[PDB]
Amino acid sequence: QKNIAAFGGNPKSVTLFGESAGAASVSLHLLSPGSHSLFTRAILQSGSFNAPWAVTSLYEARNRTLNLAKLTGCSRENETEIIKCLRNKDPQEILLNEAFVVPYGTPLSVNFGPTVDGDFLTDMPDILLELGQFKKTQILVGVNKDEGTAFLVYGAPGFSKDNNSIITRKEFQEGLKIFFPGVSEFGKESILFHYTDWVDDQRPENYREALGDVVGDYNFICPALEFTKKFSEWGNNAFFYYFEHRSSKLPWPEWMGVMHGYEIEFVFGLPLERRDQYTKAEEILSRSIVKRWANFAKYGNPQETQNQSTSWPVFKSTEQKYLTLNTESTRIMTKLRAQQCRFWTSFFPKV
Amino acid sequence: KIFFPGVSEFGKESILFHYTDWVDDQRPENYREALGDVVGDYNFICPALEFTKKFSEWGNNAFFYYFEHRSSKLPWPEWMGVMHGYEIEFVFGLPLERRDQYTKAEEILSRSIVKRWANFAKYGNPQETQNQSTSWPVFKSTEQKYLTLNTESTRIMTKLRAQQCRFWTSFFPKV
Amino acid sequence: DIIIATKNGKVRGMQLTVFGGTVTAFLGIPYAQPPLGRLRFKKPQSLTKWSDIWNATKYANSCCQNIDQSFPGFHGSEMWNPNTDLSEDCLYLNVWIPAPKPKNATVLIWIYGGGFQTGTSSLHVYDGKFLARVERVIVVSMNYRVGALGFLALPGNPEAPGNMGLFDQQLALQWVQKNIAAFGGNPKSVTLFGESAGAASVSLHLLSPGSHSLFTRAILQSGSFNAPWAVTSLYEARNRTLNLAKLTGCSRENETEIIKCLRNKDPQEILLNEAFVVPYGTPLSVNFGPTVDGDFLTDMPDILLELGQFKKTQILVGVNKDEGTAFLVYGAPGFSKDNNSIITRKEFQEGLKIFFPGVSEFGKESILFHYTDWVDDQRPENYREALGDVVGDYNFICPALEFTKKFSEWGNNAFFYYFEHRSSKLPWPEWMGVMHGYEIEFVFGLPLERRDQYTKAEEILSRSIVKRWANFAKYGNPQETQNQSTSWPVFKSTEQKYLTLNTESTRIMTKLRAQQCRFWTSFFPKV
Ligand SMILES: *[C@@H]1O[C@H](CO[C@H]2O[C@@H](C)[C@@H](O)[C@@H](O)[C@@H]2O)[C@@H](O[C@@H]2O[C@H](CO)[C@@H](O)[C@H](O)[C@H]2NC(C)=O)[C@H](O)[C@H]1NC(C)=O
Ligand SMILES: *[C@@H]1O[C@H](CO[C@H]2O[C@@H](C)[C@@H](O)[C@@H](O)[C@@H]2O)[C@@H](O[C@@H]2O[C@H](CO)[C@@H](O)[C@H](O)[C@H]2NC(C)=O)[C@H](O)[C@H]1NC(C)=O
Ligand SMILES: *[C@H]1O[C@H](CO[C@H]2O[C@@H](C)[C@@H](O)[C@@H](O)[C@@H]2O)[C@@H](O[C@@H]2O[C@H](CO)[C@@H](O)[C@H](O)[C@H]2NC(C)=O)[C@H](O)[C@H]1NC(C)=O
Ligand SMILES: *[C@H]1O[C@H](CO[C@H]2O[C@@H](C)[C@@H](O)[C@@H](O)[C@@H]2O)[C@@H](O[C@@H]2O[C@H](CO)[C@@H](O)[C@H](O)[C@H]2NC(C)=O)[C@H](O)[C@H]1NC(C)=O
Ligand SMILES: *[C@@H]1O[C@H](CO)[C@@H](O)[C@H](O)[C@H]1NC(C)=O
Ligand SMILES: *[C@@H]1O[C@H](CO)[C@@H](O)[C@H](O)[C@H]1NC(C)=O
Ligand SMILES: *[C@@H]1O[C@H](CO)[C@@H](O)[C@H](O)[C@H]1NC(C)=O
Ligand SMILES: *[C@@H]1O[C@H](CO)[C@@H](O)[C@H](O)[C@H]1NC(C)=O
Ligand SMILES: *[C@@H]1O[C@H](CO)[C@@H](O)[C@H](O)[C@H]1NC(C)=O
Ligand SMILES: *[C@@H]1O[C@H](CO)[C@@H](O)[C@H](O)[C@H]1NC(C)=O
Ligand SMILES: *[C@@H]1O[C@H](CO)[C@@H](O)[C@H](O)[C@H]1NC(C)=O
Ligand SMILES: [Ca+2]
Ligand SMILES: [Ca+2]
Ligand SMILES: [Ca+2]
Ligand SMILES: [Cl-]
Ligand SMILES: [Cl-]
Ligand SMILES: [Cl-]
Ligand SMILES: [Cl-]
Ligand SMILES: [Cl-]
Ligand SMILES: [K+]
Ligand SMILES: [Mg+2]
Ligand code: NA
Ligand code: NA
Ligand code: NA
Ligand code: NA
Ligand code: NA
């Protein structure tokens, strides 16, 4: 705000964009009254603060601060004395102990993250979202087709980047234990139930695909769609995309599909670099995404107006139109993961 | 186990789960009341409400009532409340018989139900038009208005057992 | 040790433990010159400034008032009596703030009832510490003058212009605009709330142009200014000021000479005579209350309501299931807190005489007629229940519903509740049901105190009401969003949806007391 005019920029036309925790951050700036006047609009790539990894409760937070003290020989009496001790520790001694403040972590553990501090965040963010207490502006929100797969190779039994990861029923069950460690037996059976009614050939990859869907729907896609619904109910324009292109250069194996984080290079326009070995179709998809992001930032409308492109409709409650981003045919579709999200959003929270 | 013998372990836990989140005093009758609700919702009330929704979606007028008066003469004990089958005597007008030991309020409730059933039969509209009565609204998808039948205050209400019926009607059949 | 710098100087507070946490309480901060001597009966004058640290560590003097002596030793009446010294030196206010000091907290300002004749901010059931702890709001409450000391009127004469206690309230709201940021509060997010005459006061601030910029929204618990006890006409007002003079040996010639005489009287001599300025009073008499003064209130409030001349904002409005019963034991024949109060037809008739003394014979028969068409068993309590319904519908429920309709017709969101839970601890007997004033303890979160012998279901109902009031104040929408709760719909003309508050099943219902209110609102006024 203070300096960008000197570089030829317009402080009145600032768009935030971010991916994963970076997207959850963009979403919290839409909520924080101290950020309201520092930006114009927002773009959220695979993340939002209502994802179940994004915000730590006060209770877990103090428990984690105190466990960190026990581990560093910093358990004290005066709280300000705990911190003063902690300031004397070598940064390495703090990093080494971070993983252990939690009794069981998952590959998506966020040990130290946003909290309701009464300053940045004045109330529980789900309450602010629901009651319309956020900056009124346009948003662009999206997710990748295979969000969940990247995490399976960081602890799910029977998975591996170096084979096809065909797993059994029993391995799937063990995998729900790895990803949902605090959850009751019934809570875990209910997941198995929703995701294993096969249609239907006895395909060997049934369980492998189901486990990636479980992880992506719960952690990324359903919270993104739900954030988008509630936000657009207060009258602002929203645009939703489903990214479904697997990079020709992806070094992870094929079963992992269109992974978490692998739209970013298209957004930054790396395939525009011809001397770089992306394909021609990839250059053109990146060039269209670049123009759409740029139009959204400048004009609040992510259209590509010159090349007979598919027109991107606004996302509303009720119709829930979204746009697919791929190398062949750009399509408008409706009600992404409708059945799955009813499960995660209206049933599972009760569990 | 007695009421859902063919049902999986998970199917049965899901019932326990929906019906035992207590609100909340540790009341000793919690489980007794929950088990009667389970049996009535699954077997009678949710299928009735669901039949009424689907039928009225094709354009016809429907009227829905919730009967909540316990007969002063009921020989079953009190914990059983407003039992299955014990509206019938009000519909047939037995309490109209004064020499029969129903109360005055019961004679009047039966007399109003008799007139409503009769008007529905003759005129297709179950109103009691002469005695400043509550007007019975048609039941539609979306609003789901229904009328309560009782001895004190006749009321229009909406969305009977909404949460319970979402369970029986959209989840449980999958089990 | 907690010291805050105000515009008028430093104040010191004290810390309280509440549910394993801390709240900081500043009790007894002055907000005006003591209105003594030549200032008796005048508008509150602004306060000078102190050098040194003002100690705000105990409740202050309550204002001069007659006391309820109908049931000595009985906690049901006596919990409403003042619990600090009575004095004309009573213009003080209280502040409860969360600890650690909040950054920009919403502010809730409580205005007590008592008929404009009684009441005090220091009562136990108005202690703001529970709301500050649980909801992280700041809670403010003030004392304001009541009785003749607060509402004597010779309209247009600044020695006794009328509405002085409403001006006392107004000046405390200004104190909050100027000072609350120093305590971590947001002057841009202030909600008024009040019960009974306190609610009627909140409603008059929605009408008074001098209050428009001192608050954001309003909550009205069992009261509004269109209730028939809430506003005195100019005619009754002068008659009452002059009768008061006859009684004190102050009848004079020059009006300013009447007031000067009255300023020499002992406060007791004024209190003693207050009951007699009226030829026949009822248990709901308001001898000295709001008037159309041309200053606070620029026209008859029913005219302002009807023509849309009020602050545009959200409101939350509600009533209790048995508003009328508390008043029956203060003069209705055959009633008693110590028996079941089964009364006859003839006692009911005598009771209408006690409650509607200026009303014609036909006016009284019309009431009997609307409320005694029995349905139908010859139940012995028919007449007892009918008389409480009469008193509650006329005085509280129908004026509240009517205020809510007219207000929401000008485009603002309104929420209406019907409170139907009888406290497990109620010391009044059962036939009195869900009495007037006995939601207040749920709103202030007293049952959150486990060591206090309310039930578990009561803790949970209070916790949900607390969250709803807090959300309304912060966000203008009284939802409880986390616990699968019933969603509270806005009240509109036409549908008239309202929410029930009870321990079992929270319900949305429509058209509360439709038939009764047609009677009170469209027929009875003609009588
Ligand atoms: C895919 O590989 C996994 C991962 O573990 C292995 O990596 C392989 C490429 C292989 O070279 C192997 O030596 C290495 O350990 C296999 O899962 C393992 O299966 C064994 C049974 O031998 C289990 O006891 C192991 O605990 C399990 N390891 C882990 C870390 O879970 C997996 O079976 C294989 N799948 C195929 C080929 O379909
Ligand atoms: C309920 O009590 C009233 C109130 O008056 C009485 O309080 C009682 C508890 C009792 O001890 C009695 O001594 C005391 O006076 C009764 O009303 C009274 O009824 C009498 C007839 O005896 C009338 O002449 C009185 O004027 C009347 N008193 C008042 C102040 O109105 C009432 O009858 C009783 N009702 C019951 C038991 O159902
Ligand atoms: C927060 O509090 C305790 C902390 O216990 C932890 O001690 C830390 C220093 C760290 O090393 C961590 O791994 C360890 O768990 C949690 O209680 C644990 O759970 C077990 C259950 O078997 C208990 O026996 C112990 O109290 C403790 N474990 C061990 C091995 O000492 C507690 O669960 C946690 N609260 C949460 C997650 O809500
Ligand atoms: C206002 O004016 C007179 C005031 O009369 C009153 O004198 C006061 C000092 C006080 O003690 C009060 O009790 C007394 O009533 C009212 O007229 C009264 O009504 C009677 C009817 O029987 C008349 O005979 C008298 O003028 C007077 N009564 C007595 C006993 O002296 C008048 O009604 C009132 N106006 C209103 C209420 O609108
Ligand atoms: C603890 O010590 C700090 C810093 O040394 C001091 O300022 C504070 O007053 C003390 N607090 C408590 C709670 O003992
Ligand atoms: C539009 O088409 C031209 C060629 O016809 C091409 O060079 C370019 O990549 C396209 N522009 C955008 C923004 O997609
Ligand atoms: C209507 O009211 C009359 C008396 O006023 C009564 O006798 C009768 O029971 C009522 N009729 C019906 C149909 O309810
Ligand atoms: C206010 O409170 C403290 C007591 O803790 C005292 O030191 C101070 O002087 C008091 N002021 C008075 C009594 O005026
Ligand atoms: C508090 O919030 C308001 C808006 O409701 C804002 O204008 C104000 O300046 C804020 N003050 C702070 C954080 O001190
Ligand atoms: C009466 O006396 C007052 C005050 O002493 C004086 O100012 C005023 O002019 C007089 N008014 C009338 C109407 O006689
Ligand atoms: C919500 O539910 C929790 C327990 O599940 C309970 O402790 C609390 O009283 C509730 N919160 C509100 C605001 O009602
Ligand atoms: Ca976490
Ligand atoms: Ca006390
Ligand atoms: Ca009056
Ligand atoms: Cl199994
Ligand atoms: Cl569709
Ligand atoms: Cl509804
Ligand atoms: Cl008669
Ligand atoms: Cl209706
Ligand atoms: K389920
Ligand atoms: Mg009171
Ligand atoms: Na990772
Ligand atoms: Na890459
Ligand atoms: Na029978
Ligand atoms: Na009273
Ligand atoms: Na009480």
CSV table of C-alpha atoms in Angstrom, one decimal, chain C residues 143-358:
chain,number,residue,atom,x,y,z
C,143,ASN,CA,-28.2,4.1,37.5
C,144,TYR,CA,-30.7,6.7,36.3
C,145,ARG,CA,-33.2,8.7,38.4
C,146,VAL,CA,-36.7,7.2,38.9
C,147,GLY,CA,-40.1,8.5,40.3
C,148,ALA,CA,-40.7,12.2,40.6
C,149,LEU,CA,-37.0,12.8,41.0
C,150,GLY,CA,-36.5,11.4,37.4
C,151,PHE,CA,-39.8,12.2,35.7
C,152,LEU,CA,-41.6,15.2,37.3
C,153,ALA,CA,-42.8,17.4,34.5
C,154,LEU,CA,-44.0,21.0,33.8
C,155,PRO,CA,-43.4,20.7,30.1
C,156,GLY,CA,-41.3,23.5,28.5
C,157,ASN,CA,-40.0,24.6,31.9
C,158,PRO,CA,-36.3,23.7,32.2
C,159,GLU,CA,-36.5,23.6,36.1
C,160,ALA,CA,-38.6,20.4,35.6
C,161,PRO,CA,-38.9,19.7,31.9
C,162,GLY,CA,-39.6,16.0,32.3
C,163,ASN,CA,-37.7,12.8,31.1
C,164,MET,CA,-34.6,13.6,33.2
C,165,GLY,CA,-33.9,9.8,33.9
C,166,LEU,CA,-34.1,9.2,30.1
C,167,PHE,CA,-31.5,12.0,29.8
C,168,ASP,CA,-29.5,10.3,32.6
C,169,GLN,CA,-29.5,7.2,30.4
C,170,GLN,CA,-28.5,9.3,27.4
C,171,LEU,CA,-25.6,10.9,29.0
C,172,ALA,CA,-24.2,7.5,30.1
C,173,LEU,CA,-24.4,6.3,26.4
C,174,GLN,CA,-22.3,9.4,25.5
C,175,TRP,CA,-19.8,8.5,28.3
C,176,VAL,CA,-19.5,5.1,26.5
C,177,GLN,CA,-18.9,6.9,23.0
C,178,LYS,CA,-16.2,9.1,24.5
C,179,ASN,CA,-14.4,6.6,26.9
C,180,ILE,CA,-14.9,2.9,26.0
C,181,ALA,CA,-12.0,2.6,23.5
C,182,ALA,CA,-9.7,3.1,26.5
C,183,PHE,CA,-11.1,-0.1,28.0
C,184,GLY,CA,-10.7,-2.0,24.7
C,185,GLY,CA,-14.3,-1.4,23.5
C,186,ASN,CA,-15.7,-0.5,20.1
C,187,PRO,CA,-18.0,2.6,20.3
C,188,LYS,CA,-19.1,1.6,16.8
C,189,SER,CA,-20.6,-1.7,18.1
C,190,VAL,CA,-22.9,-0.9,21.0
C,191,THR,CA,-26.1,-2.8,21.7
C,192,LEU,CA,-28.7,-1.5,24.2
C,193,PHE,CA,-30.7,-4.1,26.2
C,194,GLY,CA,-33.2,-3.8,28.9
C,195,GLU,CA,-36.3,-5.4,30.5
C,196,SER,CA,-39.8,-4.0,31.3
C,197,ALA,CA,-39.4,-0.2,31.8
C,198,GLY,CA,-35.8,-0.7,30.8
C,199,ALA,CA,-37.1,-2.2,27.5
C,200,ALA,CA,-39.5,0.7,27.1
C,201,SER,CA,-36.5,3.0,27.5
C,202,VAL,CA,-34.5,1.1,24.8
C,203,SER,CA,-37.5,1.7,22.5
C,204,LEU,CA,-37.6,5.4,23.2
C,205,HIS,CA,-33.9,5.7,22.4
C,206,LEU,CA,-34.8,4.2,19.0
C,207,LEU,CA,-37.1,7.2,18.7
C,208,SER,CA,-35.0,10.0,20.1
C,209,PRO,CA,-32.8,11.8,17.5
C,210,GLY,CA,-30.3,12.8,20.3
C,211,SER,CA,-29.6,9.0,20.8
C,212,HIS,CA,-29.4,7.9,17.1
C,213,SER,CA,-25.6,8.1,17.1
C,214,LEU,CA,-24.9,6.6,20.5
C,215,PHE,CA,-25.7,3.0,19.7
C,216,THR,CA,-25.8,0.4,17.0
C,217,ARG,CA,-28.7,-2.0,17.8
C,218,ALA,CA,-31.4,-2.8,20.4
C,219,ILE,CA,-32.8,-5.7,22.4
C,220,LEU,CA,-36.2,-5.3,24.1
C,221,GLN,CA,-37.1,-7.9,26.9
C,222,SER,CA,-40.8,-7.7,28.0
C,223,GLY,CA,-41.5,-3.9,27.3
C,224,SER,CA,-41.8,-1.3,24.6
C,225,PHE,CA,-43.0,2.4,24.7
C,226,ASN,CA,-46.5,1.5,23.2
C,227,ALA,CA,-47.4,-0.5,26.4
C,228,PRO,CA,-50.3,1.4,28.1
C,229,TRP,CA,-48.2,2.0,31.3
C,230,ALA,CA,-45.2,3.5,29.4
C,231,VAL,CA,-46.0,7.1,28.5
C,232,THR,CA,-47.8,9.7,30.5
C,233,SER,CA,-49.9,12.4,28.7
C,234,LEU,CA,-49.1,16.1,29.2
C,235,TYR,CA,-52.5,16.4,30.8
C,236,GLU,CA,-52.0,13.6,33.4
C,237,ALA,CA,-48.4,14.9,33.9
C,238,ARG,CA,-49.3,18.5,35.0
C,239,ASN,CA,-52.2,17.1,37.1
C,240,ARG,CA,-49.7,14.9,38.9
C,241,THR,CA,-47.1,17.6,39.3
C,242,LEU,CA,-49.8,19.8,40.9
C,243,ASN,CA,-51.3,17.1,43.0
C,244,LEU,CA,-47.8,16.5,44.4
C,245,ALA,CA,-47.6,20.2,45.3
C,246,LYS,CA,-51.0,20.3,47.1
C,247,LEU,CA,-49.7,17.3,49.2
C,248,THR,CA,-46.4,18.9,50.1
C,249,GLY,CA,-47.6,22.4,51.0
C,250,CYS,CA,-46.1,23.6,47.7
C,251,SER,CA,-49.1,24.8,45.8
C,252,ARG,CA,-48.0,28.2,44.5
C,253,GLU,CA,-48.6,30.7,41.7
C,254,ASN,CA,-45.4,31.1,39.6
C,255,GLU,CA,-44.7,27.6,38.2
C,256,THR,CA,-40.9,28.2,38.9
C,257,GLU,CA,-41.9,28.9,42.5
C,258,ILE,CA,-43.6,25.5,42.7
C,259,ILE,CA,-40.4,23.8,41.8
C,260,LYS,CA,-38.2,26.0,44.1
C,261,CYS,CA,-40.5,25.0,47.0
C,262,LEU,CA,-40.2,21.3,45.9
C,263,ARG,CA,-36.4,21.5,45.9
C,264,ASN,CA,-36.5,22.4,49.7
C,265,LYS,CA,-38.4,19.2,50.6
C,266,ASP,CA,-36.7,16.2,52.1
C,267,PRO,CA,-36.5,13.3,49.5
C,268,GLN,CA,-38.7,11.2,51.9
C,269,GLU,CA,-41.5,13.8,51.8
C,270,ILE,CA,-41.5,13.5,48.0
C,271,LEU,CA,-41.4,9.7,48.0
C,272,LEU,CA,-44.2,9.3,50.6
C,273,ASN,CA,-46.5,11.5,48.5
C,274,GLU,CA,-45.8,9.9,45.0
C,275,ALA,CA,-48.5,7.2,45.4
C,276,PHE,CA,-51.3,9.7,46.0
C,277,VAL,CA,-51.0,12.0,43.0
C,278,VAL,CA,-53.3,9.6,41.2
C,279,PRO,CA,-57.0,9.1,42.3
C,280,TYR,CA,-56.9,5.3,41.9
C,281,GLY,CA,-53.8,3.3,41.1
C,282,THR,CA,-53.4,-0.3,39.9
C,283,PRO,CA,-50.5,-2.6,40.6
C,284,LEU,CA,-49.0,-1.4,37.3
C,285,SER,CA,-49.4,2.4,38.0
C,286,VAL,CA,-46.6,4.5,36.6
C,287,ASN,CA,-47.1,7.7,38.4
C,288,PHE,CA,-44.1,9.6,37.1
C,289,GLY,CA,-42.7,8.4,33.8
C,290,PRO,CA,-41.8,9.4,30.2
C,291,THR,CA,-43.7,12.3,28.6
C,292,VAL,CA,-43.7,14.2,25.3
C,293,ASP,CA,-41.3,16.9,26.4
C,294,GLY,CA,-40.4,18.4,22.9
C,295,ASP,CA,-36.8,17.5,23.6
C,296,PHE,CA,-36.1,13.8,24.2
C,297,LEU,CA,-39.4,13.0,22.6
C,298,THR,CA,-40.5,15.4,19.9
C,299,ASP,CA,-44.1,14.0,19.2
C,300,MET,CA,-46.4,11.3,20.4
C,301,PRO,CA,-44.5,8.1,20.1
C,302,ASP,CA,-47.3,6.2,18.4
C,303,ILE,CA,-47.2,8.8,15.6
C,304,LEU,CA,-43.4,8.4,15.2
C,305,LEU,CA,-43.7,4.6,15.2
C,306,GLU,CA,-46.6,4.6,12.6
C,307,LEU,CA,-44.8,7.0,10.2
C,308,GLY,CA,-41.5,5.4,10.3
C,309,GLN,CA,-39.6,8.1,12.2
C,310,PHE,CA,-37.0,6.1,14.1
C,311,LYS,CA,-33.5,4.7,13.9
C,312,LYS,CA,-33.1,2.0,11.1
C,313,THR,CA,-31.3,-1.0,12.6
C,314,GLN,CA,-32.0,-4.6,13.7
C,315,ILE,CA,-34.0,-5.4,16.8
C,316,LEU,CA,-34.5,-8.5,19.0
C,317,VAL,CA,-37.8,-8.5,21.0
C,318,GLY,CA,-39.4,-11.1,23.3
C,319,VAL,CA,-41.9,-11.9,26.2
C,320,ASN,CA,-42.4,-14.5,28.8
C,321,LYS,CA,-45.3,-17.0,28.8
C,322,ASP,CA,-46.8,-15.7,32.0
C,323,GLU,CA,-46.1,-11.9,32.1
C,324,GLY,CA,-49.3,-11.1,34.0
C,325,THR,CA,-49.2,-13.4,37.0
C,326,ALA,CA,-46.7,-11.5,39.3
C,327,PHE,CA,-49.1,-8.5,39.5
C,328,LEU,CA,-52.1,-10.4,40.6
C,329,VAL,CA,-50.8,-10.9,44.2
C,330,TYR,CA,-50.5,-7.1,44.7
C,331,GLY,CA,-54.2,-6.4,45.0
C,332,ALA,CA,-56.5,-8.8,43.0
C,333,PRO,CA,-59.0,-10.2,45.6
C,334,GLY,CA,-58.7,-14.0,46.2
C,335,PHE,CA,-55.1,-14.2,45.0
C,336,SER,CA,-52.1,-15.2,47.2
C,337,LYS,CA,-48.6,-16.5,46.7
C,338,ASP,CA,-49.3,-19.0,49.6
C,339,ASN,CA,-52.2,-20.9,48.0
C,340,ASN,CA,-53.4,-22.0,44.6
C,341,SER,CA,-55.6,-18.9,44.1
C,342,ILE,CA,-58.7,-20.6,42.6
C,343,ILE,CA,-61.0,-17.6,42.1
C,344,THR,CA,-64.7,-17.3,41.3
C,345,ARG,CA,-66.5,-15.4,38.4
C,346,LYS,CA,-67.2,-12.7,40.9
C,347,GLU,CA,-63.6,-12.3,42.0
C,348,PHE,CA,-62.5,-12.1,38.3
C,349,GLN,CA,-65.0,-9.2,37.9
C,350,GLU,CA,-63.6,-7.4,41.0
C,351,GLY,CA,-60.1,-8.0,39.6
C,352,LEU,CA,-61.0,-6.2,36.3
C,353,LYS,CA,-62.1,-3.3,38.5
C,354,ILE,CA,-58.7,-3.3,40.2
C,355,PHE,CA,-56.8,-3.5,36.9
C,356,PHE,CA,-59.0,-1.3,34.7
C,357,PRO,CA,-60.3,1.4,37.1
C,358,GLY,CA,-60.9,4.2,34.6
